[PDB]
Design a protein around this ligand. Structure first.
Ligand code: CLA
Ligand code: CLA
Ligand code: CLA
Ligand code: CLA
Ligand code: CLA
Ligand code: CLA
Ligand code: CLA
Ligand SMILES: CCCCCCCCCCCCCCCC(=O)OC[C@H](COP(=O)(O)OC[C@@H](O)CO)OC(=O)CCCCCCCCCCCCCCC
Ligand SMILES: CC1=C(/C=C/C(C)=C/C=C/C(C)=C\C=C\C=C(C)\C=C\C=C(C)\C=C\C2=C[C@H](C)[C@H](O)CC2(C)C)C(C)(C)C[C@@H](O)C1
Ligand SMILES: CC1=C(/C=C/C(C)=C/C=C/C(C)=C/C=C/C=C(C)/C=C/C=C(C)/C=C/C2=C(C)CCCC2(C)C)C(C)(C)CCC1
Ligand SMILES: CC1=C(C/C=C(\C)CCC[C@H](C)CCC[C@H](C)CCCC(C)C)C(=O)c2ccccc2C1=O
Ligand code: SF4
Ligand code: SF4
Lengths: 139, 80, 225, 75, 729, 142
């Protein structure tokens, strides 16, 4: 399961809401080499524990913003952070990184998705597919 | 959710992937450009439609487009 | 001070608290927010974050300042209007040798300033006679300026109500026109940026409104003895 | 001397300096946000007054919004 | 969630936006889930039935309320001294002063005063008693019921029309020209001859005795034997008194021309011959297109035959384009209807048809303003739905090289030259106005640039006006055109030369300036609409706009920023220019007619050449009574108009909040409010079913434009009605 | 016998009554009198102000024609010198820099040559380099 000590924080009013306990939340875990201070994506600053740190957030964008801050705002670069999605039923779904390799670099084994084999100027006219349930890009 | 489509004018500059804040895009090997890599959108269910990927694309017009469709909680970026 | 003074002072309180709300929200949420968690990385002056998340127009601190300028204008306009009318109605005037005091507007503030129609009729329409009838005299330079104030304000609405895509397309067509005659400029013309469009709109708006009020006040005060 | 007897001078001076003050206050509200975006450093502002500004700001804005709405209505 | 059932994308939205967009896309049958063409056409047919029934119910309600709480029988005894009554007032929120103020027009209770000018219409068409009005209201109720049942019926499976039936242009044109237009006009002429004219000549005729009262002493004999002139002998003399037998003639079809000496309106017999002649012409026109007997033209061959060496393919394949695209037809119909509505206003303020309606100035002004605003709205809608057609139903390959596709070939030239003409008008018109204002303000009003409207005065002379002394065509008695023995000339020349009517009003430099300003406004609004319609397909900034639909927010801040880039946004921008142009038009009309009615044409003539005169002599001057509707000293009958004036001045300003402030600010504020609600005790027991979100960008633009337009219309209507009622009413 | 609704200002009672009180525009005290005598030639309405007629007749050519040629010559001068300067700049390896920092020698040299703009314009139109071909101009997608 998820393991980690929460960072030393005084709390804030910009944290979680009823959505986390009703719909879903997100978690981020990372090993800090040394204790230091980082900016909470919800506002304020928090001291993160040395070793493994675990943090709960409300949106995936907030978790990824925190991950970018960790990767770019500390001289010892934090590269091991993992972002999971936490369901109210207790199931934990691992989100980022998808395969242990950052998406910014090409890794063998990934499958191309959403890729079209034509230029954007070769899309069909709407009048040829009207009264269908599709869109020019979808066909 | 929104639809992110990538066309064959991509040159594997990875700018769209880096500009994505919600980690929707990725890089997959290709053979149509010098970089031998093309962008991919395997996690479009998390996309919000901020168009940063379109803003970062260097090719003429865009090799990547975002069409805003059905709005979900994730797409609308709601924290409540 | 009567009922009207109470109402106007609390109106001032409302306007000031609203302007404070706008500016304080701009300062507090400048770094980030629930909608945008990394706003500070975009900078202080950025137009938007895109149509994602339902639409993220005017989330920067600069846009909060741009919105607070209008509310400051409204609050200060109400303040100066209250001062002018109250001074004319219950303070200024003339003193007869008998000792009686005849005020400029015969003390109509206490009975008219309790309705919006009172402000429209007994203050704006009533006291605008001295500026609209200024033509042919030394005060005509005010009347002209008065109309000038009513113009730029309207002009500003053509920047605040519209967006830059339409103007960019129109500039594309006009560039085609100038290209047909081989007179196209080397410096490619582009429509104003979103931030610049907002700034131009608010600037011309404030200019027009303030010039209108200045001309009205000067033409009124130079004619009440 | 004679400033009160000249109604035009009174009105002009009052309105002019009032507008100047309003513009300056708006500029304060602007450049404060500029500082917050640029020169704010969370490392040196742990659990100080600024941090607790950023940590109960939502209550501030909500209560301020309520008072603004209430004043607007009941005025 | 169930609503909206026609779009599963919206139905799965957790936010309140689903409630908004569901309303917005409700009547857009094309984009509904699982929609076929046949179902689309059948649903449109039923909806059109519904709108027709609604129109009939509205007319019936007008008739019924006028009959019930009006003073129609009292008004006909003195049309020039009694105010018509619209409907009674029942407001528990009223006070004693309002009750005393609104008890007007001789009524015994608070009541309104009608300004739709329907009393004059009912008097002219023949109805004179309350029972007739009641019978008309009941009959219109029955008609609405019949049309509603028809809409239900032609929706059942055994009666749903086929798709081939809908796409039958020739039969529809034949039936709707010979039958809908010609037969209705002929029936109206028969109503005027059989009922309206005898009623106006004193002889009462109704359903009880119209079967035994011949409209003419010689019944059907001269008509069938070719001796038609019998029906034109013995017209109504100049001494005829409307509704009586004093000076009444016996002719039922005349060509008198001009106006009635007493009612200052057109002769009824002239209307009879007019509608009869146009009925004959329409019936002839309705026998043109081939349907089932071999004879008749076919639209496709006519369109494909009119080619040209300069336009390329000419009008080829246009038949399919128009028939297969409902938006093309809607745009054509809207443009035609807007032009016709403008024509109705222009030819109805100057050529009144109803008795004693030219002396009721308030109703004339209201009618002109109303129908002109309707025409402006329709003209905007035509271009909007044409842009929609270009986005959706335009097939480039089918229309290859014809006029439709060739428009997009020189669209840049269109927009360029239209921008040039708009700028050329605006620059040198505002320059002249500002020059006159500055020079007048400097105490030297004699250096004003005053240009005589030479061409318009020449046209007036050619139509017969002899004031300008041009002596051309109908103004020249020696010319052939004035020596043809036309039966209308002696009356028409008498009517136009009189200065007691609006027939070809005298003009001066101010009218020149304001007509050129109106031209500027028309060309600029057309520029916006045309540019949006042509760029809807795509442009340099967005080469693939068609893939993004007709109405989309933007393309993000990238590529330099793309705010207001959709064609919907072009329509949104053009609406403001439409409103401004209508404001200029109506201000000019109202000020000119105020001068005409009061007899003080000199005020307008002197002061309309500089903008300060417009500001002071029209706005400041005529607002004196409006704003005094309710006073610290009392309340008069204009109180409601003052209240609505302020109401419009408020809604107009409220629109600015949506037009200026944009989404992100309100979204963050709503975040804070959501947190506050969720953290408050005794309030967490209640939770929203739909997550509250800020209004979308396009929705915000639409809402701001709606508040803006409502405030604009209400403010101007209140000001116009109050000013005219106080001055003359 | 045209303009029966217009009268010469010389015998217009309103203009004559109001012309003795014309304001002096400049420091010269005779400016009012000069304006009064010069405006007596034109046509006045009942309001006493002069009017202009632009139907095309040469009797009133002073109202619109003479100023029309006067303005058109200057406008053509400005447009031609601007276009020629732009075209010459276009081949200097940095046209934009010379667009913000004006090449004053070349600018004035083109200024002094603009009085022959109609002859230059017709020569350019005949030579075919005044107007570009539609196939050589960028256009937005249809
Ligand atoms: C002592 C006063 C003071 C000082 C020193 C500064 C200093 C600064 N401000 Mg600031 N500001 C002030 C007052 C002040 N401000 C006030 C009162 C306001 C509220 C309106 C602002 C609002 C403000 C914003 C919104 C921004 C700044 C920015 C800046 C920075 C420089 C960029 C800039 O504005 O230059 C460029 C200046 C201009 C382009 C101004 C020229 C155009 C003006 C508006 C025309 C004014 C028209 C005039 C009043 C009437 C003319 C009429 C006409 C017909 C002739 C700099 C740190 C910018 C920043 O972020 O930098 C860090 C920025 O974005 N300021
Ligand atoms: C507190 C303010 C107030 C209120 C509540 C009213 C209320 C009323 N006035 Mg009134 N009035 C007021 C102030 C007020 N007045 C003032 C200050 C003046 C000036 C002195 C007047 C002058 C005045 C006159 C002259 C008349 C009235 C009339 C009326 C009545 C109209 C009946 C009605 O609304 O049904 C009809 C309801 C509507 C038309 C609804 C329109 C508004 C909605 C929002 C539009 C619908 C939008 C949308 C499609 C709704 C969807 C469906 C919905 C169920 C969700 C009503 C009792 C009239 C009357 O008594 O005759 C009946 C009348 O002739 N008033
Ligand atoms: C004689 C046969 C006949 C007649 C009378 C009609 C009549 C009508 N058809 Mg129609 N139709 C016909 C045959 C006929 N059809 C055939 C054969 C077909 C199949 C090919 C169709 C297919 C068809 C379709 C598909 C539709 C219609 C519709 C309509 C209605 C449109 C409303 C309208 O125009 O009235 C109002 C307008 C007028 C009466 C004339 C317009 C006004 C004129 C131009 C100018 C104004 C005159 C005057 C100055 C104004 C009055 C002033 C006064 C108030 C003071 C109308 C009732 C529509 C509908 O749904 O209706 C149910 C529709 O969608 N028709
Ligand atoms: C279009 C509608 C319409 C209708 C329904 C009627 C109906 C009528 N008219 Mg009438 N009329 C109309 C238009 C109309 N008229 C017009 C436009 C004029 C021109 C001024 C007249 C002139 C007129 C006169 C002068 C007389 C009538 C008479 C009559 C009545 C019996 C004669 C008749 O029409 O039988 C027609 C019968 C036929 C066999 C005609 C042949 C079939 C045709 C071609 C169809 C009848 C109630 C007469 C009357 O009151 O009672 C005798 C009478 O004297 N009408
Ligand atoms: C014959 C008339 C006619 C018809 C049949 C249509 C039909 C259509 N139009 Mg169209 N249109 C028309 C006239 C018409 N239009 C005119 C005159 C204009 C100019 C304003 C437009 C402008 C227009 C635009 C800009 C768009 C359409 C669209 C559409 C399509 C679907 C959306 C829609 O209309 O429903 C939905 C309609 C609404 C939700 C309107 C509700 C707004 C209400 C009526 C405002 C009421 C104000 C308020 C109540 C005032 C209160 C007053 C109180 C305070 C006293 C549909 C095919 C849309 C499209 O492209 O779809 C394909 C679209 O984007 N039309
Ligand atoms: C009074 C307000 C006002 C004014 C003057 C304009 C003026 C203009 N609009 Mg605009 N517009 C307005 C309000 C206004 N708009 C509003 C509220 C809307 C709704 C959003 C629009 C929507 C709109 C659209 C959608 C379009 C326009 C277009 C135009 C141009 C058309 C040319 C024209 O009409 O006259 C000619 C122009 C003028 C007379 C204005 C110039 C006046 C100045 C004073 C000249 C002198 C310059 C001055 C001395 C500079 C001093 C600067 C220094 C002091 C700092 C013009 C620039 C169209 C366009 O671009 O056409 C090419 C166009 O596409 N506007
Ligand atoms: C419909 C618009 C219209 C247009 C375009 C013209 C155009 C013209 N009119 Mg004209 N005119 C008009 C309406 C119009 N008119 C009307 C309505 C009237 C009746 C009042 C007149 C009465 C009228 C008279 C009496 C005369 C003209 C003349 C002229 C010509 C003057 C030649 C000139 O100055 O160029 C010269 C250019 C250069 C030297 C460079 C010019 C072609 C004159 C003419 O016939 O000249 C041959 C002339 O004497 N006009
Ligand atoms: C008072 C209004 C004045 C302003 C209104 C608009 C001013 C714009 C006029 C510009 C001319 C447009 C180019 C003409 C368009 C053009 O030259 O097309 C070529 C066309 C020749 O037509 P064809 O014989 O090729 O075919 C005409 C049809 O039969 C089918 O094409 O010329 C005309 O018809 C001129 C009339 C156009 C109207
Ligand atoms: C040459 C030149 C250029 C280019 C110029 C170009 C390309 C011009 C192109 C022009 C075109 C294509 C068309 C022009 C049409 C002109 C028309 C239609 C003129 C109409 C004139 C009328 C209607 C005269 C009207 C009456 C004429 C009469 C004399 C009286 O008054 C009365 C009155 C006003 C009625 C620039 C722009 C590059 C630079 C300029 O400096 C010079
Ligand atoms: C884009 C588009 C569209 C739209 C457009 C529009 C909307 C248009 C409009 C247009 C218009 C709106 C037009 C108008 C026209 C008019 C005219 C053209 C008129 C004419 C007239 C005349 C010619 C007259 C003459 C005369 C006189 C003057 C006097 C004597 C007698 C007579 C009759 C001879 C559509 C949908 C279609 C299609 C698609 C695309
Ligand atoms: C009209 C308009 C434009 C087009 C306007 C442009 C391109 C500005 C053109 C300015 C001209 C070139 C100069 C006028 C202003 C100068 C300051 C004048 C200086 C004068 C002295 C030299 C004497 C936009 O780009 C825009 C963008 C976003 C929202 C609204 C709008 C908008 O409304
Ligand atoms: S930014 Fe554009 S070109 Fe670069 S990798 Fe992404 S899609 Fe390809
Ligand atoms: S409308 Fe303009 S400001 Fe708003 S999201 Fe789109 S590009 Fe950004």
């Amino acid at each position: 399961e998820l393991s980690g000590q929460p960072p030393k924080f005084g709390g804030s009013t910009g944290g979680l809401l009823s959505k986390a306990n009703r719909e879903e939340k997100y978690a981020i875990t990372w090993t800090s080499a040394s204790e230091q201070v980082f900016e909470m994506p919800t506002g304020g600053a928090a001291i993160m524990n040395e070793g493994e740190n675990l943090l709960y957030l409300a949106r995936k964008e907030q978790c990824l913003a925190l991950g970018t801050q960790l990767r770019t705002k500390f001289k010892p670069k934090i590269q091991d952070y993992k972002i999971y999605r936490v369901y109210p039923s207790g199931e934990v779904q691992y989100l980022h990184p998808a395969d242990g390799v950052f998406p910014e670099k090409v890794n063998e084994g990934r499958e191309a998705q959403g890729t079209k084999t034509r230029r954007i100027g070769q899309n069909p006219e709407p009048v040829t597919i009207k009264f269908s349930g599709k869109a020019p890009y979808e066909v | 959710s929104h639809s992110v489509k990538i066309y064959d004018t991509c040159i594997g500059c990875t700018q769209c992937v880096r500009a994505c804040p919600l980690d929707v895009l990725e890089m997959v090997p290709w053979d149509g450009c010098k970089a031998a890599q093309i962008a991919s959108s395997p996690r479009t269910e998390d996309c919000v439609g901020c168009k940063r990927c379109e803003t970062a694309c260097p090719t003429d017009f865009l090799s990547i487009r975002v069409y805003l469709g059905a709005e979900t909680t994730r797409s609308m970026g709601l924290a409540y | 001070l009567g009922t009207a003074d109470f109402m106007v002072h609390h109106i001032h309180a409302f306007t000031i608290h609203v302007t404070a709300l706008i500016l304080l929200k701009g300062v507090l949420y400048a770094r980030s927010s629930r909608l945008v968690p990394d706003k500070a990385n975009l900078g202080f002056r950025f137009p938007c974050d895109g149509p994602g998340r339902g639409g993220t127009c005017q989330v920067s601190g600069w846009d909060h300042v741009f919105l607070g300028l209008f509310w400051m204008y409204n609050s200060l306009s109400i303040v100066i209007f209250h001062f002018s009318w109250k001074m004319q109605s219950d303070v200024w005037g003339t003193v007869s040798p008998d000792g009686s005091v005849t005020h400029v507007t015969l003390g109509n503030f206490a009975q008219s300033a309790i309705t919006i129609n009172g402000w429209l009729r007994d203050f704006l329409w009533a006291q605008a006679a001295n500026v609209i009838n200024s033509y042919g005299s030394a005060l005509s330079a005010y009347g002209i300026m008065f109309l000038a104030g009513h113009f730029v304000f309207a002009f500003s609405l053509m920047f605040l109500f519209s967006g830059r895509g339409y103007w960019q397309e129109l500039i594309e067509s006009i560039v085609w026109a100038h290209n047909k005659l081989n007179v196209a400029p080397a410096i490619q013309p582009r429509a104003l940026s979103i931030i610049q469009g907002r700034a131009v709109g608010v600037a011309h708006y404030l200019l027009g409104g303030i010039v209108t009020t200045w001309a009205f006040f000067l033409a009124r005060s130079l004619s009440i003895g | 001397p004679y400033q009160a007897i000249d109604y035009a001078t009174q009105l002009s001076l009052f309105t002019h300096h009032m507008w100047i003050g309003g513009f300056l206050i708006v500029g304060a509200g602007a450049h404060g946000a500029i500082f917050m975006v640029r020169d704010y450093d969370p490392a040196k502002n742990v659990n100080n007054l600024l941090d607790r500004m950023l940590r109960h700001r939502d209550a501030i804005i909500s209560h301020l919004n309520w008072v603004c709405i209430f004043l607007g209505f009941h005025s | 969630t169930k609503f909206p059932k026609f779009s599963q994308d919206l139905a799965q939205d957790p936010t309140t936006r689903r409630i908004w967009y569901g309303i917005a896309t409700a009547h857009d049958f094309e984009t509904h889930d699982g929609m076929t063409e046949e179902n689309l056409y059948q649903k449109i047919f039923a909806s059109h039935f519904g709108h027709i029934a609604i129109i009939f119910l509205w007319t019936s309600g007008t008739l019924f309320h006028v009959a019930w709480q009006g003073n129609f029988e009292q008004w006909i005894k003195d049309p020039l001294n009694i105010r018509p009554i619209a409907h009674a007032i029942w407001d528990p929120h009223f006070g004693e002063g309002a009750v005393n103020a609104f008890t007007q027009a001789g009524a015994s209770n608070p009541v309104n005063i009608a300004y739709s000018g329907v009393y004059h219409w009912f008097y002219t068409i023949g109805m004179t008693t309350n029972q007739e009005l009641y019978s008309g209201a009941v009959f219109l109720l029955v008609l609405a019921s019949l049309f509603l049942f028809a809409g239900w019926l032609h929706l059942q499976p055994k009666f749903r029309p086929s798709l081939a039936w809908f796409k039958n242009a020739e039969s529809r044109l034949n039936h709707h020209l010979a039958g809908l237009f010609g037969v209705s006009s002929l029936a109206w002429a028969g109503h005027l001859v059989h009922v309206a004219i005898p009623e106006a000549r004193g002889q009462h005729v109704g359903w009880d005795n119209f079967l035994s009262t011949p409209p003419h002493p010689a019944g059907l004999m001269p008509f069938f034997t070719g001796n038609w002139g019998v029906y034109a002998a013995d017209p109504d003399t100049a001494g005829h008194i409307f509704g009586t037998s004093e000076g009444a003639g016996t002719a039922i079809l005349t060509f008198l021309g001009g106006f009635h000496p007493q009612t200052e309106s057109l002769w009824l017999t002239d209307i009879a011959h007019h509608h009869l002649a146009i009925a004959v012409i329409f019936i002839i026109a309705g026998h043109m297109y081939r349907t089932n007997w071999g004879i008749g033209h076919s639209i496709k061959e006519i369109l494909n035959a009119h080619k040209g060496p300069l336009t390329g393919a000419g009008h080829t394949n246009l038949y399919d384009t128009i028939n297969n695209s409902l938006h093309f037809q809607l745009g054509l119909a809207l443009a035609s209807l807007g032009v016709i509505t403008s024509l109705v206003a222009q030819h109805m303020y100057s050529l009144p048809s109803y008795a004693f309606i030219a002396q009721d100035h308030t109703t004339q002004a209201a009618l002109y303003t109303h129908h002109q605003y309707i025409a402006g709205f329709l003209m905007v809608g035509a271009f909007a739905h044409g842009a929609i057609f270009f986005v959706r139903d335009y097939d480039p390959v089918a229309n290859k090289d014809n006029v439709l596709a060739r428009m997009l070939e020189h669209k840049e030239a269109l927009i360029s030259h239209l921008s040039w003409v708009s700028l050329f008008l605006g620059f040198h018109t505002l320059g002249l106005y500002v020059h006159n204002d500055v020079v007048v303000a400097f105490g030297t009003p004699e250096k004003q640039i005053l240009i005589e409207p030479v061409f318009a005065q020449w046209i007036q002379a050619t139509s017969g006006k002899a004031l300008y002394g041009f002596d051309v065509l109908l103004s020249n008695p020696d010319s052939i055109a004035s020596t043809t023995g036309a039966a209308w000339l002696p009356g028409w020349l008498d009517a136009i030369n009189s200065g007691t009517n609006s027939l070809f009003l005298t003009i001066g430099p101010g009218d020149f300036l304001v007509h050129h300003a109106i031209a500027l406004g028309l060309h600029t609004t057309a520029l916006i609409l045309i540019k949006g319609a042509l760029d809807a397909r795509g442009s340099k900034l967005m080469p693939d706009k068609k893939d993004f639909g007709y109405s989309f927010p933007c393309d993000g801040p990238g590529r330099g920023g793309t705010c207001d880039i959709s064609a919907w946004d072009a329509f949104y921008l053009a609406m403001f220019w439409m409103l401004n142009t209508l404001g200029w038009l109506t201000f000019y009309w109202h000020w000119k007619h105020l001068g005409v009615w009061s007899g003080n044409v000199a005020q307008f003539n002197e002061n309309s050449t500089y903008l300060m005169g417009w500001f002071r002599d029209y706005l400041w001057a005529n607002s004196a009574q409006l704003i005094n509707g309710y006073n610290p000293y009392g309340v008069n009958n204009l109180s409601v108009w003052a209240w609505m004036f302020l109401f419009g001045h408020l809604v107009w300003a409220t629109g600015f909040m949506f037009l200026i402030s944009w989404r992100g600010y309100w979204q963050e504020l709503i975040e804070t409010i959501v947190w506050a609600h969720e953290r408050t005790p005794l309030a967490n027991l209640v939770r929203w079913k739909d997550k509250p979100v800020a209004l979308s960008i396009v929705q915000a633009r639409l809402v701001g434009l709606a508040h803006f337009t409502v405030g604009y219309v209400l403010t101007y209507a209140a000001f116009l009605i109050a000013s005219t009622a106080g001055k003359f009413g | 016998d045209d303009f029966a609704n217009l009268t010469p200002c010389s015998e217009n009672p309103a203009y004559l009554a109001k012309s003795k009180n014309f304001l002096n525009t400049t420091n010269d005290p005779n400016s009012g009198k000069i304006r009064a005598e010069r405006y007596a030639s034109a046509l006045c309405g009942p309001e006493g102000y002069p009017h202009l007629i632009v139907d095309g007749r040469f009797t009133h050519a002073g109202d619109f024609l003479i100023p029309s040629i006067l303005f058109l010559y200057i406008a053509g001068w400005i447009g031609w010198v601007g276009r020629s300067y732009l075209i010459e700049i276009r081949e200097s390896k940095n046209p934009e820099m010379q667009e913000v920092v004006i090449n004053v020698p070349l600018a004035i040299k083109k200024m002094l040559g603009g009085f022959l703009w109609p002859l230059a314009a017709v020569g350019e139109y005949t030579s075919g380099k005044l107007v570009m071909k539609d196939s050589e101009i960028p256009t937005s997608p249809r």
